[PDB]
Amino acid sequence: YNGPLSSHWFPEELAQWEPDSDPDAPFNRSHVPLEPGRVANRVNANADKDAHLVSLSALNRHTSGVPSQGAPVFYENTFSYWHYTDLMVYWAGSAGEGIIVPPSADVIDASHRNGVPILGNVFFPPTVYGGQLEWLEQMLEQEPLADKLLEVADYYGFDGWFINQETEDEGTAEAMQAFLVYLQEQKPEMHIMWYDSMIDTGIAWQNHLTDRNKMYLTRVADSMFLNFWWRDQRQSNELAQALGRSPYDLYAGVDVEARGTSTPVQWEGLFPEGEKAHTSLGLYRPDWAFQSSETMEAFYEKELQFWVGSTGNPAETDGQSNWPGMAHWFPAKSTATSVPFVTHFNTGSGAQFSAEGKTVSEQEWNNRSLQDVLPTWRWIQHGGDLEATFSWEEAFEGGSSLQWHGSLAHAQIELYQTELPISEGTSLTWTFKSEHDNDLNVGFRLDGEEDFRYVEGEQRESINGWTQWTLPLDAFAGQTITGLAFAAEGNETGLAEFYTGQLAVGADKPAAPNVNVRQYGIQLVWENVHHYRVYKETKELIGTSAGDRIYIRLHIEALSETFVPSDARMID
Amino acid sequence: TYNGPLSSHWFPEELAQWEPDSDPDAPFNRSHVPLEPGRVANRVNANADKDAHLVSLSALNRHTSGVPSQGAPVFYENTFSYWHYTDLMVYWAGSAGEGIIVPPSADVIDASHRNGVPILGNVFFPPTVYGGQLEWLEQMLEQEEDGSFPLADKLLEVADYYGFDGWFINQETEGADEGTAEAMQAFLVYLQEQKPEGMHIMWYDSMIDTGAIAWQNHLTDRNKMYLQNGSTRVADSMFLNFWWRDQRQSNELAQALGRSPYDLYAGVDVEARGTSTPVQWEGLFPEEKAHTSLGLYRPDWAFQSSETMEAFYEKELQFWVGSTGNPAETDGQSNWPGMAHWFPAKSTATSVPFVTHFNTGSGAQFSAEGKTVSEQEWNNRSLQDVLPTWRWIQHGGDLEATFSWEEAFEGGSSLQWHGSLAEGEHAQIELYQTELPISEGTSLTWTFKSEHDNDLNVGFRLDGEEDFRYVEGEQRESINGWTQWTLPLDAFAGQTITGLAFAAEGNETGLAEFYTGQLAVGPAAPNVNVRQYDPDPSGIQLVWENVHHYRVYKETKHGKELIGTSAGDRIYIEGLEVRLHIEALSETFVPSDARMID
Ligand SMILES: [Ca+2]
Ligand SMILES: [Ca+2]
């Protein structure tokens, strides 16, 4: 592979970095803005609306060699629990590869679709792993590299930086405090998170907000990630209040890298029973789920166990378990707050790629820019003996569907918390396969009502073996949909096996793109559209893009937010 | 990017001048795993009969060309594991574009042979619509003054050198006359005369006596001369085309010819729909005894219709065992009762030492003694073990049994036994039909992990008691987080084990999750030479002369890395850029000292 790569810098490389001189820079730009105004659920009675959750995840295993816009690899870190996350930190950086590292565009897009701000990484490594004081001194030069950090974030389109100083005086310490204050003064409406490590004298992790580290939070940073070795956080909460700062800008670190759900934690020291606070929660390396597994299925099973709990139901969490799950303390958030809302249950990778329920490529692929907004609840069912999981065997658009299967001798599955204003012309649409001939009803919940309305669709269409129902919602114009769900009824078979490959609320074709065959060993550039597809006549899908370009008789189409394709621009 | 040895394939004129000693790939294509004799059959299914045989026509490799000789760094590969319901395997391959004479690849011959299943190569004369040429048929049918057929000799030479058990002959090329037909019959008779004992020649029901392609779907007067002609044996068996409703008249005609009706294999085409294939089972298995044997066309549907190893394996279970998921309890009223409904499972666990590590033939990772020695995807079906006779038979609990590719002791897989088991509740899983003589110094060993601290007991059945004996081990060892038990069987010397099982008890947790990575009842450092592999100048081969397989490790900054495995006499390595370590593992998986190669 010789295509564009996600960026990473040593301080002296960054200082002379310019987008216009960097052939990979345009491929590393995100074109999916941060979704504002997420809406929270209320399924878990224990969950509080005070604490936030930061995730420090190695969304790419390595700093270097990361393709800008996806790769032909099924097993990739397709993290799907954005709904329990308030802030994502791209975990990366090393002495051998580069210490300043922005998130890759594919991951920025996925984060942004879910309304989660994502931060780049500034990592001053420990000296035992090749860390150098020089790099720290270079970054702290005063009269430029803070300006450069802010430039990278603006150009690539991410939301700030995580600063992690781990390289082993007071002059340097004070210069760091000035660097951080400078950032605060110069940043846009952006987050700067600092790791609890270097103290006032210049490395002594406090595991709390204390006198030694308080000057790193006039004000100097948006938050602090607290080191792991604590038993109680009340002191940090009290001191934060004394400083006139929210205790919830403090993120009490938990190291889950090695053991994940088997990590021992003193939860009561962070979440006192029948009590508020003490602080927010910082997760170090939840990508445990991915790095400790060999297969997509096991990876996804572990993420469920980690974020939801052993119950497998976000509404019925067990707070006395060794791992109650993140759903036990944190409301799920949803970016399904705008019409049109459209999902195809795309997990961000596949063993195959489908268009209208037909395989258009048999190759493995990942492109997290194509990951949809996935269900708020994993999983809430009523009735029957059924399991809900993602399937990479069947897909309507992309590489995955939602599978709902098992025994059914009435059953419902509640999928989405939403905030969708209904107007005339708005319709509900959904597309599924059924192996035992059972129909699949849609469910929708209206604001001011606590029960879902389950109905059969009005108009049925058959698309390559898939059934697509349409349900006009003109009768509820002026109302707001607050939930989405499905329902089914058992037949003589006694079995149910559904694959659902799309779900949408709204209505609607984009113009053929002006595509220019250009040099990188090629680069297509084109300038309402969800993503672009590049077919090859043999038709075979050879590329997808959510940006303004792709590196590869060709046919290029723009798909709208509703997934209506444009006429294909032919190119030779 | 692969520039190493490839599995062979030929057009008739390429075969004609083929010589093993000149072919750089030939030594890589030799199977070094002999056909296991004397399989033992189970009796779990009351309906199953012992008369009918089953032939499988499987595309064990999706393509004819580009098939690496000894495996590849690819997890998703056709790792067929229902050898136990198969009597004969036909390697499905050949095309007008790639080659029409195609032997099975060595990895697939090994796996077949480990399970006591004869495996046949393919000779495919394609329909003219798909590039078929009468010339190819005419070339194969060339005859010396001798009366000999030089290309028949070549078929026998290939089978002998590569070590497989015969040929499937499929004549689908239109435009042949009665003279061609008689020459084909003479070619087939010549094979019967010259073949080694035990070699099998199967003929497709296609070209009739006139030369015309008119599939009969039965044994009839139009095709009988391709099986038997008076007292002349023409072929060992016939694969009957798909369009039949009843086979009684085939059975009757076979008897009139003095041949077993079970040398006739009634074709069922399952390529597109697998378990959803409509079949008139009654027309084959009536009321008494089966009319004929069964021919399954493309059961590799399970692989080719799936995207992932897990769904592939689930489909094979549904296909071969049926919707019950229990070979002992099939549903004969189902549209698909499964193969276990009619066929006894056979086992080759008939010899001490019997050793398995539940290696499915591929993995996402490779382990040695419970530690990952390579994180790369791999397949090498030469390493596929003899897997459980029964998929699956359990008693008690709420457990599921499946293969896991997340955990492994040796190779890329383990047997996962997991779910709910309430405190004090007992559960058993019966795995193997066996025939293992116990003598002094014989022991049972098994290696597992338990995620909720339940112990795993072994089960063994003695001839011919009906109950399994469930006992805890006696000597425990901890190996990289895995527990290995040893149970001496000196107390039962002179007895024969006829089955193997496992058992567990539920604890306070109410949950059980086992991964079992070895089960067993029961070398010198390899002399290694670095040799040129002529077609690839930047490549090498290691050649050496008791041993299950060889493992090739290379030194890294991160510890030893597994870079190759071989069940033959050699291995090809691309781009060797280096210190290598080659060990021989015994049948008991005792490793030799490593031979160091620079
Ligand atoms: Ca595929
Ligand atoms: Ca792996």
Author numbering:
A (entry chain D): 3 to 145, 151 to 175, 178 to 198, 200 to 212, 214 to 228, 233 to 424, 428 to 526, 529 to 540, ...
B (entry chain A): 2 to 288, 290 to 524, 530 to 552, 556 to 586, 588, 595 to 615
Text from the published report:
Endo-β-N-acetylgucosaminidases (EC 3.2.1.96) (ENGases) are a class of enzymes that hydrolyze the glycosidic bond - GlcNAc β-1,4GlcNAc - present in N-linked sugar chains in glycoproteins and release the N-glycan moiety. Endo-A from Arthrobacter protophormiae is modular in architecture with three distinct domains. Domain 1, with residues 2–350 being identified, is the largest and displays a typical (β/α)8 TIM barrel fold, which has been observed for proteins belonging to family GH18 and GH20 of the glycoside hydrolases. Endo-A catalyses hydrolysis and transglycosylation via a substrate-assisted mechanism, in which the C2 acetamido group mounts a nucleophilic attack at the anomeric carbon resulting in the formation of an oxazoline ion intermediate.
In summary, we have determined the crystal structure of Endo-A, the first representative structure for members of the GH85 family of hydrolases. The overall architecture of the domain 1 is similar to that observed in the structure of Endo-F3. In addition, the structure of Endo-A reveals two smaller domains, primarily made up of β sheets. The secondary structural elements of these two domains are interdigitated. In the structure of ligand-free Endo-A, H2O846 is interacting with Y205 and could fulfill the role of a potential nucleophile. Analysis of the structure of Endo-A reveals that the Y205F mutation probably results in loss of a potential nucleophile, H2O846, which is hydrogen bonded to the hydroxyl oxygen of Y205. In the structures of the free Endo-A and Endo-A bound to Man3GlcNAc-thiazoline, the side chain of W244 is perpendicular to W216 and introduces a steric block at the entrance of the active site. The overall structures of the Endo-A in complex with Man3GlcNAc-thiazoline and Endo-A in complex with GlcNAc-Asn are identical to that of the free protein.
